[PDB]
Amino acid sequence: VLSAADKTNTKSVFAKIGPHAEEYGAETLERLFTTYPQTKTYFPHFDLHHGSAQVKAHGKKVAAALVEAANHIDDISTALSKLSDLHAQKLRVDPVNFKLLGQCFLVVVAIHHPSLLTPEVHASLDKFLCAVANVLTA
Amino acid sequence: VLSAADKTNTKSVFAKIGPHAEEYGAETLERLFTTYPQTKTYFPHFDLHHGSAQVKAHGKKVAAALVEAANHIDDISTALSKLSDLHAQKLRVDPVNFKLLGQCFLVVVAIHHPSLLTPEVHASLDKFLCAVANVLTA
Amino acid sequence: VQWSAEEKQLISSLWGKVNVAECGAEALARLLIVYPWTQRFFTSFGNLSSASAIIGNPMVRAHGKKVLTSFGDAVKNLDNIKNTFAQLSELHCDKLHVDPENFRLLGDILIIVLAAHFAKEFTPECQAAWQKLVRVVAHALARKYH
Amino acid sequence: VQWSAEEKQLISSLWGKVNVAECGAEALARLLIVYPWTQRFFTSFGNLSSASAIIGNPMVRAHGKKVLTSFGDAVKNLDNIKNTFAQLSELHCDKLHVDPENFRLLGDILIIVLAAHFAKEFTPECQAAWQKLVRVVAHALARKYH
Ligand code: HEM
Numbered sequence: 088v089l090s091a092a093d094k095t096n097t098k099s100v101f102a103k104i105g106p107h108a109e110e111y112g113a114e115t116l117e118r119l120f121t122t123y124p125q126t127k128t129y130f131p132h133f134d135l136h137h138g139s140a141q142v143k144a145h146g147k148k149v150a151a152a153l154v155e156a157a158n159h160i161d162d163i164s165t166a167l168s169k170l171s172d173l174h175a176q177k178l179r180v181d182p183v184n185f186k187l188l189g190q191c192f193l194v195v196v197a198i199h200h201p202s203l204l205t206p207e208v209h210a211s212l213d214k215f216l217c218a219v220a221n222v223l224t225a
Numbered sequence: 226v227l228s229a230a231d232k233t234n235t236k237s238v239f240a241k242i243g244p245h246a247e248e249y250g251a252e253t254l255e256r257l258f259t260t261y262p263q264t265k266t267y268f269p270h271f272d273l274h275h276g277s278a279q280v281k282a283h284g285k286k287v288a289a290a291l292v293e294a295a296n297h298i299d300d301i302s303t304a305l306s307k308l309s310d311l312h313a314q315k316l317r318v319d320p321v322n323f324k325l326l327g328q329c330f331l332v333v334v335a336i337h338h339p340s341l342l343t344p345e346v347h348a349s350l351d352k353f354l355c356a357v358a359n360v361l362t363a
Numbered sequence: 364v365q366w367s368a369e370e371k372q373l374i375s376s377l378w379g380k381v382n383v384a385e386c387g388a389e390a391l392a393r394l395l396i397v398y399p400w401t402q403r404f405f406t407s408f409g410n411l412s413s414a415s416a417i418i419g420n421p422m423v424r425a426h427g428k429k430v431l432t433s434f435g436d437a438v439k440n441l442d443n444i445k446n447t448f449a450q451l452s453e454l455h456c457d458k459l460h461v462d463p464e465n466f467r468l469l470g471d472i473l474i475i476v477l478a479a480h481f482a483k484e485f486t487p488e489c490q491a492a493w494q495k496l497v498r499v500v501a502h503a504l505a506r507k508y509h
Numbered sequence: 510v511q512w513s514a515e516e517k518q519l520i521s522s523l524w525g526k527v528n529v530a531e532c533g534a535e536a537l538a539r540l541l542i543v544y545p546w547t548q549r550f551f552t553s554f555g556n557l558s559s560a561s562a563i564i565g566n567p568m569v570r571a572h573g574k575k576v577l578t579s580f581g582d583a584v585k586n587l588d589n590i591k592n593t594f595a596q597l598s599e600l601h602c603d604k605l606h607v608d609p610e611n612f613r614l615l616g617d618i619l620i621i622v623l624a625a626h627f628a629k630e631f632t633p634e635c636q637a638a639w640q641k642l643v644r645v646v647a648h649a650l651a652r653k654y655h
Pocket residue numbers: 126129130145148149152153170173174178180184185188189219220223
C-alpha cells in the first residue's frame with residue numbers, strides 16, 4: 088500500500104505540476120506514442136500527429152484522472168471507478184502498457200521540474216502510478 | 226480485487242487439496258528449485274536435494290500459509306503478517322520470484338486434480354496467488 | 364543455447380505422447396480466459412464472450428492445434444530454433460505487435476496443460492526441460508524486437 | 510537490432526554531454542531506493558540503511574559511475590553491443606543471479622535521470638532512441654542467462 092509518506096510525496100508533486108496538468112498530459116501521450124509506437128494501435132481512430140486536437144484533448148483527460156487519484160489517494164479504486172471497465176473489459180489494454188505510460192509521465196515531470204523527483208519522491212510516485220495501473224487493469 | 230467468484234473458486238480448490246497441502250507444498254518447492262534453480266540462492270543453507278527432509282519441512286509451512294490466506298480470503302494482509310517483513314525487508318525477495326512459485330503451485334494442482342483446475346478456476350487461483358504475493362512484497 | 368542429453372531425451376520423449384489438437388486447443392483457451400486482454404488479438408475468431416464460448420469456439424481450437432504444432436517444430440530441431448521461428452517472429456512483432464511478455468504467459472499455460480495431461484510423469488525434471496524449451500521458443504519469437 | 514542514422518546521432522550527441530559521475534550516482538541510488546529488493550546484491554557496499562545513506566554511500570557513487578561508463582561503451586560501438594557486454598552477462602547471470610527484469614528497471618531509471626539532466630533537449634525522439642539503447646543493453650546482458 089501507499090504509506091503516509093508516499094501520499095504526502097505524491098500530493099506534493101501534484102501541487103507543483105497541477106497548474107500544467109493539461110500540457111503534461113499531452114506531452115506524456117506524445118512521448119508514449121513516440122517512444123513505444125506499438126501503443127498507437129489502441130488509438131487507431133485518433134489522428135496521432137504532433138499537436139493533434141484529439142491527443143491534446145485526451146492528455147488533458149488522462150492528467151485529470153491522475154489529479155483525481157492524487158486528490159482521493161486514500162481510496163483510488165473508488166475515485167477511478169468508471170475507467171476500470173473501460174481499460175480492462177472494453178479496450179483490453181495489455182497491462183504492460185501502463186508502466187510505459189507511467190514511465191513517460193515521470194520523464195515529463197523530470198524535464199520540467201528538476202530536483203522535484205528526488206529518489207524517495209520518485210519511489211513514492213512509482214508506487215502511486217502502480218496502484219493506479221492496478222485499478223485500471225482489475 | 227479478487228471477485229466473489231474468485232474467492233469461492235480458490236476456497237473450493239483449498240477445500241479439495243487441504244488433506245494433501247503438506248505434500249503439495251513440498252512438491253511446489255521442489256519444482257521451484259529444479260525448474261528455476263536461481264531461486265536456490267535464497268536458501269544457501271538448506272539441503273536442496275530431491276527428497277530432502279528440510280525442503281519438506283519448509284514446504285509444509287508454505288502450504289500452511291497459503292491455507293490460512295485462503296481461509297481469511299477477505300483479509301489476507303493480516304493473515305500473513307510478519308511473513309511480509311521476512312520476505313520484503315530481511316530476505317529481499319525479488320518480486321518476479323513469487324510468480325515462479327505460483328506457477329509451480331499451479332502445476333502441482335494440475336497434476337493431482339486436473340478436473341478441479343478448469344480455466345476459470347485457474348484464473349481465480351492466479352489472482353489469489355498474486356494477492357498473497359502483493360502482501361509479502363509490501 | 365545448450366541442451367544436455369538428459370534434457371534432449373525428456374523433451375523428445377514427452378513430445379511423442381502429446382495429443383496436439385487437444386493440448387493446443389486447451390492452452391490457447393486458457394490463455395484467452397486467464398489473461399483476457401489476449402482476446403484483442405483474435406477479434407476475427409468471432410465469439411470470445413465467455414469461458415464456455417472460448418473453449419468451444421472452433422477458430423480457437425483449430426488455431427490452438429497450430430500453435431502447439433509450432434512447438435513440435437521446435438522439438439524436432441532444438442539447435443535450429445532461432446531460424447525455425449524467424450517467419451513467425453516477424454508476424455508476431457512487426458505485424459501483430461504482441462508484447463513478448465505474452466509469449467512467456469502462453470509458455471506457462473502450456474506447461475500447466477502438459478501437467479494436467481501427464482500427471483505424475485510430469486516430474487520436476489520434466490518440468491524443468493519444458494520450461495527451458497518454452498523459454499527458448501518465446502525468445503526465438505521475440506527475436507525481431509531485438 | 511538496426512540503428513538508424515537519426516538514432517545514432519541522438520544517442521552520441523547526448524552521451525557527449527552526460528556527466529557520467531552525476532548521472533551514474535543518481536541512477537544507482539534510485540535503483541536501490543525505488544526498487545529496494547535490489548539492495549540484496551549490494552550489501553558489501555556498506556551503509557544502505559536509509560535513503561540519505563544510500564545517496565551518500567561512496568560505493569554506490571563509484572559503482573554508479575562504472576555502470577553508466579558501461580552504457581557509454583554501448584554508445585561507442587552501437588553495432589557490437591552483444592560482445593561488449595559478454596563478460597558482464599556472465600557476471601550478472603551465471604554468478605550473481607540478478608533476474609533480467611532488473612536490467613529493464615535500471616534502464617527506465619536512467620531514462621528518468623537523463624530527463625532531469627537535460628530538460629527540453631531530451632526530446633521525444635531522443636527518449637525513443639535512448640529507451641531502445643537501454644533495451645538493447647538489457648538484452649545483451651541477459652544473453653548468457655539464456
Ligand atoms: C495509467 C494511467 C491511465 C489513465 C489515468 C487513463 C485514463 C483514461 C481516461 C481518463 C480516459 C477517458 C475516458 C473516456 O472519456 O472515455 C481514458 C480512455 C482511454 N484510454 Fe486510458 N488511461 C491510462 C492508461 C492507458 C493506457 C496504457 C492505454 C493504452 C496504451 C490507454 C488507452 C485508452 C484508450 C484507447 C481510451 C479511449 C480513448 C478514446 O477513444 O477517447 N489508457 N483513459
